[PDB]
Amino acid sequence: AIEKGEAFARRDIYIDYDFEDVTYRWDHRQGTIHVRFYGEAESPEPVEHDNRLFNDALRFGREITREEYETGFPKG
């Protein structure tokens, strides 16, 4: 899990949620969420902060590094 609050205001946060083969990038300066599905480039459209799958990723996913996120995960 990646709880809402302190960390998101502290720095960029990168998230892996293997149950749905999805990753997220949080930019704390811009306040934006982007999504990157396994085997794909990052989607250009930002994600809404009340988005269902994003909040699932917070509850059940795990934090990863910027390099892991940018390298990406093979399509499942």
């Binding site: 998101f8 749905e20 988005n51 269902r52």
Partner: protein, 194 residues
């Protein structure tokens, strides 16, 4: 509202995926003394909205077009989880110590012969009582299980989904998140103590 590319091709396998996951669900449910709450195929507009919002317009990524719930007693939940795993399901086992909201239960995704995923959830009557509104819990558990669980429950039912709704709409840096999550964990913990 934009129809996703390939949407109807995926949507048409949903009845066959439903039959498939419903067959395995009632097998496993009737094996361990439980029940299966079957549900209809996800409605068209909501399916499309979910594909566009969660999955950025790819309809092959949506996993709950067909779905059901297996309700079994608490100590059988794990047994059923292992059962779905042995059939190749992708399985998420949630314990209350990791989820910020303290929920517990099983979720699984099954790739059915029809070529789309089916969702099968598993939980105990106590957990469902705790999480869902009364109307919802009565459908999932049946009227008699609902009434049995409510009489022996040590906490008012139906608060869990409330905390989730308040927590979900918060911005990721909200000052309010931590207090709501704590209230949710304390609630589900009281349910599980008894």
């Amino acid at each position: 509202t934009q129809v996703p590319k390939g949407f109807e091709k995926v949507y048409g396998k949903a009845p066959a995926a439903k039959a498939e996951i419903d067959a395995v669900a009632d097998g496993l449910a009737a094996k361990h003394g439980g029940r299966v709450a079957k549900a209809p195929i996800k409605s068209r507009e909501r399916a499309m909205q979910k594909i566009n919002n969660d999955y950025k317009g790819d309809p092959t990524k949506i996993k709950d077009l067909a779905r059901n719930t297996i309700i079994v007693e608490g100590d059988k939940v794990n047994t059923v989880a292992a059962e779905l795993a042995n059939r190749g399901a992708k399985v998420k086992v949630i314990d209350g110590n990791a989820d910020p909201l303290g929920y517990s239960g099983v979720n699984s995704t099954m790739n059915t012969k029809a070529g789309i995923p089916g969702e099968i959830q598993v939980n105990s009557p106590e957990m469902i009582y705790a999480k869902e509104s009364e109307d919802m819990a009565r459908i999932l558990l049946g009227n008699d299980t609902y009434d049995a669980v409510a009489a022996k429950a040590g906490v008012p039912g139906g608060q869990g989904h409330k905390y989730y709704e308040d927590w979900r709409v918060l911005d990721p840096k909200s000052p309010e998140a931590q207090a709501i999550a704590e209230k949710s964990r304390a609630y589900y913990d009281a349910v599980r103590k008894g």
